[PDB]
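User: Autophagy-related protein 13,Gamma-aminobutyric acid receptor-associated protein. Structure?
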Amino acid sequence: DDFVMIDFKPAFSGSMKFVYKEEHPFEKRRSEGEKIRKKYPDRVPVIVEKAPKARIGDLDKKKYLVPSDLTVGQFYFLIRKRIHLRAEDALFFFVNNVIPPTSATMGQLYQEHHEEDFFLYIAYSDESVYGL
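Assistant: Predicted structure:
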């Protein structure tokens, strides 16, 4: 009866390339993701990498186990400190090529955007457009 109301996404959404995915075979990632979801069900596994062409410090660690109820805004706050951003430095996240809502929880993002390996992938940048 009723129509499913589909939300619009830009044409380039889902075009996120990650070095992590190139360096770790899919089935190893997927096996790990399944296991870590069972081991820590109140956390979500997240890969965080610099966006292509970003001009910003690199993280020493890419793999994060994040409480599901942590907001995107709180994750910004933590990441800024890990790379010693200055007060005037910008930081943007992208999930599937789109800046996620600052008020979303990481668990909400995970539900909507996790990949088939059971990981959520977040790119970060000094720029507000992914890969610019």
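Residues 26-39 form the longest helix (14 residues). Helices lie at 19-23, 26-39, 72-82, 106-113.
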